[PDB]
Amino acid sequence: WSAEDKHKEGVNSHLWIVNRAIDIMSRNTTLVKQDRVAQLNEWRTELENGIYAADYENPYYDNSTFASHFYDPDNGKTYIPFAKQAKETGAKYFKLAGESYKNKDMKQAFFYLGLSLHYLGDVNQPMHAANFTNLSYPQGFHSKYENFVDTIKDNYKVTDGNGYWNWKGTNPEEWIHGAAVVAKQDYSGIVNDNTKDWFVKAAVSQEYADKWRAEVTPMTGKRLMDAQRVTAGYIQLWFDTYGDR
Ligand SMILES: [Zn+2]
Ligand SMILES: [Zn+2]
Ligand SMILES: [Zn+2]
């Protein structure tokens, strides 16, 4: 998903997913301790820095190949043979964040948590769970799709307090894998012969630009709603794990 502005949701789908996940936690009045939400807001600059840094510098963006932002659940791999993938990378930063939190280094903790949230957010994008990059056929569709999502994402906010609490076990890798399983199932609702066809014809015809955008909207909304619920669960897991128990 996009992460083009550090502190603005307009062109940062990753930050929008996290902010909507925090709103789910705030809406929950049965299980969530609201001081957790206050801690995320207190260290929001560092959290947002971590969410943005993943797509912009080393080691996180893998020398501009973004290999660690992809993870196919069926084979456990990213799109480049032998490169690091999103499950081991997102789990690495979940644990580094927790160790920093226990040592009371909040700036370090929330930056590493933002990184981990970014990787979990990416495996909820079906193209990232299927190794479909901006060079895959049809080339340029991955990037135009992610730009398009920013223009519609406000229509898919989750407005209830039901995150996926304890969705998977206590291992963060299980959450990243589980989210990629669901996202790859939804891959054909976005990438298929029709959307490929219309995207290619969209260069010459505006009518086709609208056609592929409309076609991918329903599954995009579904994926964005699941990403908010899974992210809220994952933040709650992090505080349950390192927050003193
Ligand atoms: Zn992304
Ligand atoms: Zn992407
Ligand atoms: Zn990314």
Curated annotation (Swiss-Prot):
Asked if the record carries the keyword Zinc, the reply is: yes
Please name the InterPro entries in this protein's record.
Answer: PLipase_C/P1_nuclease_dom_sf (IPR008947), PLPC/GPLD1 (IPR029002), Zn_PLipaseC (IPR001531)
Give the intrachain disulfide bonds. none
GO biological process annotations for this chain's record? killing of cells of another organism
Q: Which domain of life is it from?
A: Bacteria
Binding-site positions, Zn(2+) 3: 1, 14, 122
Per UniProt, Zn(2+) 1 binds at 55, 69, 118, 122
Q: How is the cofactor bound?
A: Binds 3 Zn(2+) ions per subunit.
Cofactor(s), names only, from the UniProt record: Zn(2+)
Q: Where does Zn(2+) 2 bind?
A: 128, 142, 146
What Pfam families does the database record attribute to this sequence?
A: Zn_dep_PLPC (PF00882)
Mutation effect (residue 201 to R): In strain: IAM 1208
Q: Which residues form the Zn-dependent PLC domain?
A: 1-245
Its UniProt entry gives the catalysed reaction(s) as: a 1,2-diacyl-sn-glycero-3-phosphocholine + H2O = phosphocholine + a 1,2-diacyl-sn-glycerol + H(+)
Task: Give the EC number(s) listed in the UniProt record.
Answer: 3.1.4.3
Tell me which CDD domains the record gives.
Answer: Zn_dep_PLPC
The effect of residue 188 to A is: In strain: IAM 1208
Question: ATP-binding: present as a keyword of the record?
Answer: no
Keywords, A to Z, come to: Cytolysis, Hemolysis, Hydrolase, Metal-binding, Signal, Zinc, Zymogen
Which family does the similarity line name? Belongs to the bacterial zinc-metallophospholipase C family.
**Chain's role:** Required, with sphingomyelinase, to effect target cell lysis (hemolysis).
Describe the subunit structure: Monomer.
* Protein name from the UniProt record: Phospholipase C
